[PDB]
Write a protein that binds this DNA or RNA. Structure first.
Ligand SMILES: [Cl-]
Ligand SMILES: [Cl-]
Ligand SMILES: [Cl-]
Ligand SMILES: [Cl-]
Ligand SMILES: [Cl-]
Ligand SMILES: [Cl-]
Ligand SMILES: [Mn+2]
Ligand SMILES: [Mn+2]
Ligand SMILES: [Mn+2]
Ligand SMILES: [Mn+2]
Ligand SMILES: [Mn+2]
Ligand SMILES: [Mn+2]
Ligand SMILES: [Mn+2]
Ligand SMILES: [Mn+2]
Ligand SMILES: [Mn+2]
Ligand SMILES: [Mn+2]
Ligand SMILES: [Mn+2]
Ligand SMILES: [Mn+2]
Ligand SMILES: [Mn+2]
Ligand SMILES: [Mn+2]
Lengths: 79, 99, 106, 94, 98, 106, 86, 99
DNA sequence: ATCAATATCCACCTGCAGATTCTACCAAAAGTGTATTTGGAAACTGCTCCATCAAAAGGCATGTTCAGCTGAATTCAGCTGAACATGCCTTTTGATGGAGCAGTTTCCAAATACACTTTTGGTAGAATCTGCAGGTGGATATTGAT
DNA sequence: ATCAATATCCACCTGCAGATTCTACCAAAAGTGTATTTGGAAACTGCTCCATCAAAAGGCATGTTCAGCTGAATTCAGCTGAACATGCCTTTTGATGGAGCAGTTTCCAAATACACTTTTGGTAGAATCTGCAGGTGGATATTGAT
C-alpha cells in the first residue's frame, strides 16, 4: 500500500529522537498502524473544516484547527 | 579485515544525532502520498496546500517521537531496553488513546 | 493621539488592536477599557519571558538568530513554560536531548 | 489582502531584552501562534467567568482571574503584577 | 416578598423521551441530574464549535449548517450519522409548515 | 399559537434553545434552523442514552434508571464511551473487569 | 464563634480506604509503600481542584464554595463531572 | 482446625464486591476535614455547600480508582501482580497530566 | 589499566545565495471630541442552608500474628536485532504550462433582530403513588483441607 | 475424589422515602410588524497546485555474521494478606442561631454611539547581512590486543 512507504529506517529514525536504543521486529508494522489512525483522525476533521467552507483545497489552517480540537495544538502554521 | 562497532553503539550515536537536530524524519514524498490516500476515503478530488501537508507531517512526527519516549519508558519498566508492540499498546491505553 | 494607548500603559503590545479583537471575538456583550490593557500587558510579559530564555539558547549556540529550535529548548527547559505549553508542538523544534540512564554503556 | 500579525510587537520586545539578537521567519511564526494561543485561552476563560456570574462585561477583573486560573504559580504572579501595573499607568495617563 | 426564581431545566423533556423509548421505566432524580448535565455539556460543545466555525469562516450567523458541521466534528461516526438525520429531518419539517 | 418544538416534531424545547443560543455569546445572529437542529441532536443523543440505560435497568430488574445504569450504558457502548471519555458519572462506579493474570492458577 | 484547628488530615485517608479504591480499580495485591504514595498523589489532586474552585468563589465575591465552583474547576482540568448542576 | 482462605482469594472477592457497587469508599467526615484543611490554606473563613464537598469526593474517588486501574496495568507489564510506587509514577508520567 | 589504531564529532573559517532588515507609500484602523445610555455596584433584607452541637450505637480502623506465595536475584541458551558491505531505485529537484478555484466585489430576495403584546407551557410546592432498601431465611456454588 | 465451611444468590414482605401526578400562578415563548443585515448568486481575475518532464544522488532494500539481550528456569527470604480482639469515632438524626446567598431598588462610573482626524502596520522592492554547505584538522571516544 502507501503505508509501506513509511520505511524501516524512518520509523527507526523517529524512535531515535525518542531516545530508543533497540527495536523489536514487529514494531515497524505496529507503528504503521498507529500513524494511520492518527492521520485518519486529523484528516477526517481537517477535511470537515474544508467541506464546511465550501472549499476543495485543504488549507494549513484547516489542519491547525483539526489538530487543536484533537488536543494537539501546532505552532508555526497560523501564517 | 574490517571494523565493527559493538551492537548498540551505533544506536546511541543515532540517538544523540537526531535529538540535537530538527529535520523531518519521514521522507517527504512517501508521506504526501500517504496523506492523499487517507484523505480520499473522506472526500474526493481534494487539493492540498504544501503547508497543509507540511503541517500534517510536523504533527505526526512530533506525536510519534513522543509515543516512542513513552513506549521506551514502558520497555524499561519491564527491565528491557527493546521496545515491543506490547509497550506501544500500554502507552496508548494509559494516554487514553485506547480507553 | 499624539501619544497612544499602548504608550500610555507603557506597553509595546497593541492595546488598541487587542481591544478590537476582544470586541469581535464573541466573548461578552461589553469590553471595559481596562481589559485589553490588562491582556496586552500579560501577553507582552509572557512573550518577554520566552524571548529572554530563547535568546540565551542562541547566545549559547553563538548564532544571534533565534530559530524554532531555540524556542523549544528555551521553553521545554523551563518548568513553568513547559506546564503552560505542555500540549503544544513547536514545529521544527525537535526534542530536548535526553537518554535514559539505564541505556548508557557500562 | 491585508494580513495582520503580532510580528512588529514581538520584534520590539525582542530588542528590548536582547538588542543584539534577531529572529527567523519561522521562529516568528511560532511566536505569533503562542500569542494567538494565550490570547484565546485568557479571553475564552474571561468569557466564561462573566457568564457564570451573569455579567455582560469583560473587565480587567475577569482578565486577572483568568490569568490566575490559566498560568503556573510564579508565571501567574508576574503577569498579574504587569497587568495591574499597566492598568494603573494607563489610568494615570488620561 | 422574595419570589424564589424559577430554575429551568431539561427534566420534563428528558422524561418524555424516557417514556417514548421505555414506557414502563422511570428515573431517579440523581439519574436525572446526570441527564441534565449531559444535555448542557453537549449543548456547549456543539455551540462552542459552531461559534468557532462561523468565526473562522467570517460569518456573523450561526445557521443550522454550522450546527451540523459541529455535530460531525464532535460525534463518533455512527452516532453522528444518526444525529444528522434527525436534525436534517427536524428542520425541513420545521420549514414545511407555518 | 403553534409551538416550535411540535412544529419540528420534537420533544426538546426549540424556543428555549433559541434563547440559550442568542444569549450565550456564540455569534451576533442565530439562524431560525439552528436551535431546531440542535434541539433535534440533543433530543436524539438523549434517546440513545435512555434506550441503552433502560436495558441496563431491565437487566437488573429495576423500574427506575439510576446513575449506575447510566454508567453501564455509557461505558459499554463503544461510541458513547468515546463521546464521554472525559466525563465522570457521579455514583456510577466502574465496569466489572478483572485482568486475566489476577485469577487463580494451577 | 470558633473552629478547632485542622491538622494533618491527609492521614484520615486510611489504609483500608486506599485498599478499597484500589479494589474498585481491580488491584489484587498492594505494596506497603502504596498508601503513603497515594496520600501524596491525592493531596496534589485535591489542592489543584480546590485552588481553582476558590478562584471561582472569590471572583463571585462569595464566601461559600458552591458545587458549581467545583464543577467549573473540574471542567478546566479536563475532568468533567455530571450530577451536580450546570 | 479453623478456616483460612488462600492469600489472594479474599482480595479477589473484594475486587468483585467493590466493582458492583457505586458507594463512596473514603469515609465521609475525614474527607470533608481534608477539604476544609486545604481550602483554609488558600482562603480563610470559607463555607461549603454540602454538595460542593460531595462533588469533590466523587471526583477524587473516580480519579484515584482510575489511577489504580492504570497502575495495575503497569504492574502486570513488569510481570507482577503487586502495585508499587514505581507503577503509580510510571502511569502518572505517561498520561502526563501530572509528572 | 595501557597503547595502537581507526572512526566520528566538533571547532574554527569562507564565500555567496537566500533571507532579514530597510524605505517609502497608503488604505484601514486606532484615536478624538461630544453626546447619550446603562450594567451593576452599593445598599437593604428576606430567608435558605451552613456550621455546630449533642448523643447514642455500631460500623469499621488499628495493631498484631503467622505463613503463603510473590518479588528479587542468578544463570544461561537461543534466537532476535545490530552493524555493514553492496548495488539498485525511489525520491529530489529544478523549471514549465495549464487549470481549477480560492478570493473579492457588487447587488438584493430572504432572513434576523427588536419592541410590544397576547398566550401557553413549565415550574414550584402540595397531594398522591409506589419502587425498592433492609431484613429474613433457604437453596447453590466455591474454596480449601484430607 | 469428597465433605465442612462460607459466601453468594435469590425470593418474599412491607412501610417509607423518594419519584410521579396534580394545580395554579406566571414568566417566557410565540405573534405582529417594521428596521436592518447578510450570505450568497453571477461575473471576474491572479495564484498556488497538479500534471508532467526527466536526468543524478544519496538513501534503502538485501543478505551475512555474531554479540548480546530476552525469556525461561530455579530458589528463597521476607513482605503482604487473612483473621480477630478492641475500642474509637464516624454516622445518624434533630435542633438552633445566624451568616450570607439571592432579590429589589436606585443611580452613576463606565460603556456605547457617531462624526471626524491621525497614525500605523502591511507591503513590496532596494540595500544589507547571515547561516550553511563543505572542508579540513584536532579533540573525543571506541574497539581490540597484551
Ligand atoms: Cl491552616
Ligand atoms: Cl515470581
Ligand atoms: Cl526479597
Ligand atoms: Cl553465543
Ligand atoms: Cl557546520
Ligand atoms: Cl586532504
Ligand atoms: Mn473597568
Ligand atoms: Mn438556520
Ligand atoms: Mn492548615
Ligand atoms: Mn450620539
Ligand atoms: Mn432616551
Ligand atoms: Mn439598568
Ligand atoms: Mn484501636
Ligand atoms: Mn396549560
Ligand atoms: Mn435488597
Ligand atoms: Mn446578614
Ligand atoms: Mn422602581
Ligand atoms: Mn511604520
Ligand atoms: Mn559570517
Ligand atoms: Mn555542514
Amino acid at each position: 500500500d502507501n503505508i509501506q512507504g513509511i520505511t524501516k529506517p524512518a520509523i527507526r529514525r523517529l524512535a531515535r529522537r525518542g531516545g530508543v536504543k533497540r527495536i523489536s521486529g514487529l514494531i515497524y508494522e505496529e507503528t504503521r498502524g498507529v500513524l494511520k489512525v492518527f492521520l485518519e483522525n486529523v484528516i477526517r476533521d481537517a477535511v470537515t473544516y474544508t467541506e464546511h467552507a465550501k472549499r476543495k483545497t485543504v488549507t494549513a489552517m484547516d489542519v491547525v484547527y483539526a489538530l487543536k480540537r484533537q488536543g494537539r495544538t501546532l505552532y508555526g502554521f497560523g501564517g | 579485515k574490517p571494523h565493527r562497532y559493538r551492537p548498540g553503539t551505533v544506536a546511541l550515536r543515532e540517538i544523540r544525532r537526531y535529538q540535537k537536530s530538527t529535520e523531518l524524519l519521514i521522507r517527504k514524498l512517501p508521506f504526501q502520498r500517504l496523506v492523499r490516500e487517507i484523505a480520499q476515503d473522506f472526500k474526493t478530488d481534494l487539493r492540498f496546500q504544501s503547508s497543509a501537508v507540511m503541517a500534517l507531517q510536523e504533527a505526526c512526527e512530533a506525536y510519534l517521537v513522543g509515543l516512542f519516549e513513552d513506549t521506551n519508558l514502558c520497555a524499561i519498566h519491564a527491565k528491557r531496553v527493546t521496545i515491543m508492540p506490547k509497550d506501544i499498546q500500554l502507552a496508548r491505553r494509559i494516554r487514553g488513546e485506547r480507553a | 493621539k499624539s501619544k497612544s494607548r499602548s504608550s500610555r500603559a507603557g506597553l509595546q503590545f497593541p492595546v488598541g488592536r487587542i481591544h478590537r479583537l476582544l470586541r469581535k471575538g464573541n466573548y461578552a456583550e461589553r469590553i471595559g477599557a481596562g481589559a485589553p490593557v490588562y491582556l496586552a500587558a500579560v501577553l507582552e510579559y509572557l512573550t518577554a519571558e520566552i524571548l529572554e530564555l530563547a535568546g540565551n539558547a542562541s547566545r549559547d549556540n553563538k548564532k544571534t538568530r533565534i530559530i524554532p529550535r531555540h524556542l523549544q529548548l528555551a521553553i521545554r527547559n523551563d518548568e513553568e513554560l513547559n506546564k503552560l505549553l505542555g500540549g503544544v508542538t513547536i514545529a521544527q523544534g525537535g526534542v530536548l536531548p535526553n537518554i535514559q540512564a539505564v541505556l548508557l554503556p557500562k | 489582502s491585508r494580513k495582520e500579525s503580532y510580528s512588529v510587537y514581538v520584534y520590539k520586545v525582542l530588542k528590548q531584552v536582547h538588542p543584539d539578537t534577531g529572529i527567523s521567519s519561522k521562529a516568528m511564526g511560532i511566536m505569533n501562534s503562542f500569542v494567538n494561543d494565550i490570547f484565546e485561552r485568557i479571553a475564552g476563560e474571561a468569557s466564561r467567568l462573566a457568564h457564570y456570574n451573569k455579567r455582560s462585561t469583560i473587565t480587567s477583573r475577569e482578565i486577572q482571574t483568568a490569568v490566575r486560573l490559566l498560568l503556573p504559580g510564579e508565571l501567574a504572579k508576574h503577569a498579574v503584577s504587569e497587568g495591574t501595573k499597566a492598568v494603573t499607568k494607563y489610568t494615570s495617563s488620561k
